[PDB]
Amino acid sequence: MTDPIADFLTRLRNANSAYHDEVSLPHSKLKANIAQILKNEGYISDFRTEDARVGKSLVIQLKYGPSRERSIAGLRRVSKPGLRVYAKSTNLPRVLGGLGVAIISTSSGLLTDRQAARQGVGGEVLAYVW
Template sequence: MLTRIRNAIQARHDSVMMPHSKMKLAVARILKEEGFIRDFDTPRIHLQYREGRQSAIAGLKRISKPGLRVYVGKGEIPRVYGGLGLAIVSTSRGVMAGRQAWRDGIGGELLCYVW
């Protein structure tokens, strides 16, 4: 999913198609709430651009991979770019932004960074 978004931003596409899964919908919901994408529906994510076709997403980095899962405790959730970026964490209460997981005092699997 992250690679498809990264490629669509490089090609200046307005939207990108995604296969459906609950995890991808949860990540898309967080990206919309944080203002990184304009909107999403089941198969498509609509990207957001600023003045001069500058993307709202400057970078995406996957952290936890199938070969090496990365877990963080409640006090170990990283701040991305000094709080300007976003860490997405999969917790026992669902997928949420790193700031929300830190406020709730729960840790989980660190999925990706977005800035």
């Protein structure tokens, strides 16, 4: 069980592919922050944290369009534990030429590409959500 961020992304991608309407996984502060960013970006619906038998479990509800259409096109972790990915303000990564969002972990907290470029501080690119 390595890279819980990758595990969370993989679970979300699998559920979105299988048209699942609910996911469950143990809760962490980083996962909660990522859920907040996703909710702000509008790729997901509401999220909540519920106390399981051990620790806490973080719950994400997904969103679907009019037909059986997935708002989430795909997921891709970026900064793997095998090789970390760091980016600066002048060369912030672009996802889908601006149509995608990359989570940036800077001293101001977890931030999106455009917001991080606005304030000019870079960090570690966690993943691409696009």
